[PDB]
Ligand binder design. Sequence first.
Ligand code: ZBD
Ligand code: NA
Length: 254
Amino acid sequence: ASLTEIEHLVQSVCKSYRETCQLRLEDLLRQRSNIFSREEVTGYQRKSMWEMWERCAHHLTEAIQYVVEFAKRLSGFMELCQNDQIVLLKAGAMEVVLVRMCRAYNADNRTVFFEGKYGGMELFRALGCSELISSIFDFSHSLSALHFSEDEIALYTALVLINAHRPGLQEKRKVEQLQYNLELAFHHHLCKTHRQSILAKLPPKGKLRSLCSQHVERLQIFQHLHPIVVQAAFPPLYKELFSGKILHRLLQDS
Ligand SMILES: C[C@H](CCO)N(C)C(=O)CCCN1c2ccccc2N(Cc2ccc(C(O)(C(F)(F)F)C(F)(F)F)cc2)S1(=O)=O
Ligand code: NA
């Protein structure tokens, strides 16, 4: 691939992300003063564990649906075989969400945009997974220190998804070629914008993998306590990705 092709890939990736970003960045910023009162925080802490898990699983499922659309609009993704499309989304969708979440994180007060207002870590105490929540808040805090532009988030999350090392890929070489083109696009954009210094500050890949593992572990603990809640009230796309059909139809329906 030549230079003009790399720059066209940069614009293509940034456009696909803008169309699928779900929450507009300026909308997230304009709401930073809108914070839950102590009474509203107490209301969240008084909710039952299973109610809070269901609500968070619903919110996560909705965000994942936008990551699926990002993948479908991503250059070269729909060219891969269906097995590899599903392998990449199963391993990478949650990792993309984890990176995207930093846009709704306010590092000044350590609050996140959740259900219409900003609140701190204590909002989620009823989940009974404080270590996982604290890890996600720290991860978003680390990403916030990099001051990602929207274009940088686009290119970085494309690479999080297009990972040729995922186990189960049938056409590993094809994914390797697409990953390399995306890496050139990412690094070309950082060089042109004088932002190559962020490369050494990006999180290790085992970090994203560690957070997803924690998520699956806490889910299996909750599912053991409330199996009927998961069966009856968790989104089916959520169960397909994280518990132990939907992705196929999302990819086919376009
Ligand atoms: C990615 C998407 C659009 C891109 O801009 N976006 C901004 C959002 O969806 C908003 C999420 C904002 N939140 C956030 C951002 C930073 C750090 C923490 C948090 N939240 C706490 C939280 C809740 C729930 C969970 C869980 O659901 C999971 F699965 F994600 F870990 C769990 F509790 F079940 F574990 C894990 C942390 S949060 O309130 O969900
Ligand atoms: Na941020």
